[PDB]
């Protein structure tokens, strides 16, 4: 109808971070309540492919093919909510997450915390089994988000252990890609949610370097008390992964088809209308005011995030 295709919301393509006045203009005109889904993860891990499946439209995001490996940004695509009439689904696709283990450039990395704080549901996307690097990566953006939260008006006086925090801050979904691991414990099979809870399991009482072990896991667990995990096989034999989008659905792996259907159905039925601290529903212009408020507080701010 009137909602256009993906556009930059904020990126650093040409020098420094710039907010796209055209993206605010689009948000300003979205009078309907919005459901906001943000996705964060390393370059070319299939983030855009998955967000395009949520939108159910052609000509969606292609960040892995058109953004350079060093750019950071948030890209926005608003569509009618595929399952909730008179609701708009706001898709926030991001790029430029750095690998902390390799000392990747962290300048402007606060925009990934921004994407999380704008979201109804935050999707963290990584390849393979849950390993130390993926955990450390998640821990970094969680600490950054908590820092920005603790120090800005939208998040002020909303302690992580309260019920307001649990209810009105973003739900969390970890998507694991090219995942071939057997979801088994002692011959007995376990779910992907089970796998995630196991990876976040706390050492019970253990203390010398056991309560050091719990610290990053407790940070994640308490910042994201609403958690879900989805696993995705290779989409298709590697031969064909160059341009997955061009493949016909019947040429995908059948388990991948089911795994994408499951993810999409969960997100589109379970992600709530974005809400402020306190429960106030958020619509287009209200989201735009959140963007402005955060960007100004972080720009004008004194301390590092």
Ligand X SMILES: Nc1nc2c(ncn2[C@@H]2O[C@H](COP(=O)(O)OP(=O)(O)O)[C@@H](O)[C@H]2O)c(=O)[nH]1
Binding residues for ligand X, rule: CB under 6 A, are 43-49, 62-65, 95, 177-178, 232, 235, 241-244
Tell me if 47 is assigned to a ligand binding site: yes
Tell me if 44 is assigned to a ligand binding site: yes
Select 216 or 235, whichever has its Cβ closest to ligand X.
Answer: 235
Select 47 or 149, whichever has its Cβ closest to ligand X.
Answer: 47
Cα first-last separation, the chain: 39
Least distance (Å) between residue 68 CB and ligand X: 11
Rg (CA), the chain: 19
> What count of other Cβ atoms lies within 10 Å of the Cβ of residue 214?
18
Select 188 or 250, whichever has its Cβ closest to ligand X.
Answer: 250
Tell me if 42 is assigned to a ligand binding site: yes
Select 70 or 211, whichever has its Cβ closest to ligand X.
Answer: 70
Least distance (Å) between residue 206 CB and ligand X: 36
Tell me if 48 is assigned to a ligand binding site: yes
Least distance (Å) between residue 38 CB and ligand X: 13
Least distance (Å) between residue 189 CB and ligand X: 23
Kindly report the backbone phi and psi dihedral angles of residue 110, in degrees, each rounded to the nearest multiple of 5, phi listed first: -60, -20
Tell me if 177 is assigned to a ligand binding site: yes
| CA–CA separation, 109 and 157 (whole Å) | 24
Cβ contact 118:291 at 8 Å: yes
Tell me if 73 is assigned to a ligand binding site: no
Q: Where would I find the H helices in the chain?
A: 21-28, 47-55, 63-66, 110-118, 132-150, 163-168, 192-200, 214-223, 254-270, 284-299
Select 223 or 232, whichever has its Cβ closest to ligand X.
Answer: 232
Least distance (Å) between residue 49 CB and ligand X: 4
Tell me if 45 is assigned to a ligand binding site: yes
Across the beta sheet with 34-41, what order do the strands follow? 18-19, 7-11, 73-80, 88-95, 34-41, 121-127, 171-177, 227-231
Select 33 or 46, whichever has its Cβ closest to ligand X.
Answer: 46
Could you tell me whether strands 121-127 and 34-41 are parallel, antiparallel, or unpaired per DSSP bridges?
parallel
| CA–CA separation, 115 and 201 (whole Å) | 27
Cβ contact 122:35 at 8 Å: no
Nearest residue to ligand X, by Cβ distance, number only: 64
Least distance (Å) between residue 183 CB and ligand X: 18
Least distance (Å) between residue 246 CB and ligand X: 9
| CA–CA separation, 111 and 220 (whole Å) | 19
Tell me if 58 is assigned to a ligand binding site: no
Select 29 or 244, whichever has its Cβ closest to ligand X.
Answer: 244
Binding-site residues for GTP, in ranges, read 41-48, 177-178, 241
Instruction: Return binding residues.
Output: 41-48, 177-178, 241
């Amino acid at each position: 109808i009137n909602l256009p295709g993906p556009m930059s919301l904020i990126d650093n393509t040409k020098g420094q971070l710039v907010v796209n006045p055209e993206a605010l203009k689009i948000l300003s005109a979205i009078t309907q309540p919005v459901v906001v889904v943000a996705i964060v993860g390393l370059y070319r891990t299939g983030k855009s492919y998955l967000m395009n499946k949520l939108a159910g439209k052609k000509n969606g995001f292609s960040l892995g093919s058109t953004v350079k490996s060093h750019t950071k940004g948030i890209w926005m695509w608003c569509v009618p909510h595929p399952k909730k009439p008179e609701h708009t689904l706001v898709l926030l696709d991001t790029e430029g997450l750095g690998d902390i283990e390799k000392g990747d450039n962290e300048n402007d990395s606060w925009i990934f915390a921004l994407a999380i704080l704008l979201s109804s549901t935050f999707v963290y996307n990584s390849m393979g089994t849950i390993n130390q690097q993926a955990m450390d990566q998640l821990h970094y953006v969680t600490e950054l988000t908590d820092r920005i939260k603790a120090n800005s008006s939208p998040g002020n006086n909303s302690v992580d252990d309260s019920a307001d925090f649990v209810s009105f801050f973003p739900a969390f979904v970890w998507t694991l890609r090219d995942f071939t691991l057997e979801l088994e414990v002692d011959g007995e099979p376990i779910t992907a949610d089970d796998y995630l809870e196991l990876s976040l399991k706390l050492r019970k009482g253990t203390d010398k370097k056991s309560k050091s072990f719990n610290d990053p896991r407790l940070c994640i667990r308490k910042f994201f008390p609403k958690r879900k995990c989805f696993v995705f096989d290779w989409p298709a034999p590697k031969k064909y992964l160059a341009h997955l989008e061009q493949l016909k659905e019947e040429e995908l792996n059948p388990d991948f088809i089911e795994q994408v259907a499951e993810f999409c159905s969960y997100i589109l039925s379970h992600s709530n209308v974005k809400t402020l601290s306190g429960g106030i529903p958020v619509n287009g212009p209200r989201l735009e005011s959140l963007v402005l408020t955060y960007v100004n507080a972080i720009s004008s701010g004194d301390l590092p995030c």
